[PDB]
Design a protein around this motif. Structure first.
Motif, short mmCIF file in Angstrom:
data_model
loop_
_atom_site.label_atom_id
_atom_site.label_comp_id
_atom_site.label_asym_id
_atom_site.label_seq_id
_atom_site.Cartn_x
_atom_site.Cartn_y
_atom_site.Cartn_z
N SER A 3 65.13 85.24 71.10
CA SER A 3 65.93 84.88 72.26
C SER A 3 65.81 85.94 73.35
CB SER A 3 67.39 84.71 71.85
OG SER A 3 67.49 83.94 70.66
N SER A 4 65.98 87.20 72.96
CA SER A 4 65.90 88.31 73.89
C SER A 4 64.46 88.57 74.30
CB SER A 4 66.50 89.56 73.24
OG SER A 4 67.81 89.30 72.76
N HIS A 5 64.16 88.31 75.57
CA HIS A 5 62.81 88.47 76.09
C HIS A 5 62.72 89.76 76.90
CE1 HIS A 5 59.04 86.13 77.60
NE2 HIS A 5 58.82 87.42 77.67
N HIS A 6 61.88 90.67 76.45
CA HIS A 6 61.65 91.91 77.18
C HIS A 6 60.16 92.07 77.41
CE1 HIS A 6 65.80 93.41 76.36
NE2 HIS A 6 65.64 92.75 75.22
N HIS A 7 59.79 92.73 78.50
CA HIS A 7 58.38 92.99 78.77
C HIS A 7 57.89 94.07 77.82
CE1 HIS A 7 54.98 92.07 81.34
NE2 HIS A 7 54.65 93.34 81.30
N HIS A 8 58.76 95.04 77.55
CA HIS A 8 58.52 96.01 76.50
C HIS A 8 58.80 95.35 75.16
CE1 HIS A 8 58.41 100.19 78.55
NE2 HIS A 8 58.16 99.27 79.46
N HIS A 9 57.77 95.23 74.34
CA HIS A 9 57.89 94.53 73.06
C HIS A 9 58.57 95.43 72.03
CE1 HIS A 9 54.18 92.89 75.06
NE2 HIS A 9 54.94 91.81 74.97
N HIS A 10 58.73 96.69 72.40
CA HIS A 10 59.42 97.66 71.56
C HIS A 10 60.07 98.71 72.44
CE1 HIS A 10 60.04 100.00 67.81
NE2 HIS A 10 59.83 101.05 68.58
N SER A 11 61.35 98.53 72.72
CA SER A 11 62.09 99.47 73.56
C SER A 11 62.22 100.81 72.85
CB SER A 11 63.47 98.90 73.90
OG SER A 11 63.35 97.62 74.51
N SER A 12 62.15 101.89 73.61
CA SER A 12 62.16 103.23 73.06
C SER A 12 63.59 103.74 72.91
CB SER A 12 61.35 104.16 73.95
OG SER A 12 60.07 103.61 74.22
N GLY A 13 64.46 103.31 73.80
CA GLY A 13 65.85 103.72 73.76
C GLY A 13 66.62 103.18 74.94
N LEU A 14 67.27 104.09 75.68
CA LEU A 14 68.00 103.75 76.90
C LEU A 14 69.21 102.85 76.61
CD1 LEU A 14 68.04 104.15 79.98
CD2 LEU A 14 66.74 102.02 80.16
N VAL A 15 68.98 101.55 76.45
CA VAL A 15 70.06 100.59 76.30
C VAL A 15 70.00 99.85 74.95
CG1 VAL A 15 71.24 98.58 77.28
CG2 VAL A 15 70.14 100.23 78.80
N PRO A 16 68.89 99.13 74.65
CA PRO A 16 68.77 98.33 73.42
C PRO A 16 69.02 99.13 72.14
CG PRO A 16 66.95 97.85 74.89
CD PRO A 16 67.66 99.03 75.47
N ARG A 17 68.66 100.40 72.17
CA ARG A 17 68.86 101.28 71.03
C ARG A 17 69.32 102.66 71.50
NH1 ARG A 17 63.49 102.45 67.91
NH2 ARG A 17 63.70 100.22 67.40
N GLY A 18 69.83 103.45 70.57
CA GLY A 18 70.29 104.78 70.89
C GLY A 18 70.04 105.75 69.76
N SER A 19 71.11 106.24 69.15
CA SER A 19 70.99 107.19 68.06
C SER A 19 70.99 106.49 66.71
CB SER A 19 72.12 108.21 68.13
OG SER A 19 72.04 108.97 69.32
N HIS A 20 70.40 107.15 65.71
CA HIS A 20 70.35 106.61 64.36
C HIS A 20 71.73 106.65 63.71
CE1 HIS A 20 65.97 107.94 64.68
NE2 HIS A 20 65.85 106.68 64.31
N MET A 21 72.60 107.49 64.24
CA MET A 21 73.93 107.68 63.68
C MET A 21 74.99 107.64 64.78
SD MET A 21 73.24 110.84 61.05
CE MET A 21 75.00 111.13 60.97
N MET A 22 76.23 107.41 64.38
CA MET A 22 77.35 107.51 65.29
C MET A 22 77.84 108.95 65.34
SD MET A 22 77.13 104.71 63.35
CE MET A 22 78.26 105.11 62.03
N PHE A 23 77.23 109.74 66.20
CA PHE A 23 77.60 111.14 66.35
C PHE A 23 77.92 111.44 67.80
CE2 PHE A 23 76.31 115.70 66.87
CZ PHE A 23 77.35 116.24 66.13
N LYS A 24 79.20 111.63 68.09
CA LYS A 24 79.63 111.93 69.44
C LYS A 24 79.61 113.43 69.69
CE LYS A 24 82.37 108.09 71.18
NZ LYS A 24 83.62 107.77 71.92
#
Length: 125
Positions: A3-24
């Motif tokens: 459903s989610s169409h991105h030109h980047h087929h694998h986002s590096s970070g920024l918004v779609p992904r972030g940290s591997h853990m919940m560490f504030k």
């Protein structure tokens, strides 16, 4: 395809992904860590957390710079890189690291973990 169409087929970070853990890691604490890396030695070192849990009681947390391990769980804060091993993550998730001086003049790295109650009222109160 999905459903989610991105030109980047694998986002590096920024918004779609972030940290591997919940560490504030708070921006305030970030300066303290950065300040240590400014002193020297720990410049090109990665910030690592050590979980020393007391047998059914309280998890005592320690912070220090260590070697950048890629087989270690790498996190990226505002300006600091974190490594929390897949063994330590077992007790180091949901960690809210704030920068307060619990003692006068003594700036303590305070890990606000809901898992290990620093402040716990009685049951039914």
């Amino acid at each position: 395809m999905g459903s989610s169409h991105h030109h980047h087929h694998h986002s590096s970070g920024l918004v779609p992904r972030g940290s591997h853990m919940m560490f504030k890691l708070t921006p305030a604490a970030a300066e303290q860590v950065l300040k240590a890396a400014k002193q020297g030695g720990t410049e090109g070192m990665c910030l690592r957390l050590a979980a020393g849990r007391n047998p059914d009681g309280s998890i005592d947390y320690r912070m220090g710079f260590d070697d950048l391990t890629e087989d270690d769980i790498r996190l990226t804060s505002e300006g600091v890189e974190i490594v929390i091993a897949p063994d330590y993550v077992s007790l180091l998730d949901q960690t809210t690291l704030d920068y307060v001086e619990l003692e006068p003049g003594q700036f303590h790295f305070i890990f606000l973990n809901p898992r290990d109650p620093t402040y716990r009222p009685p049951s039914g109160g």
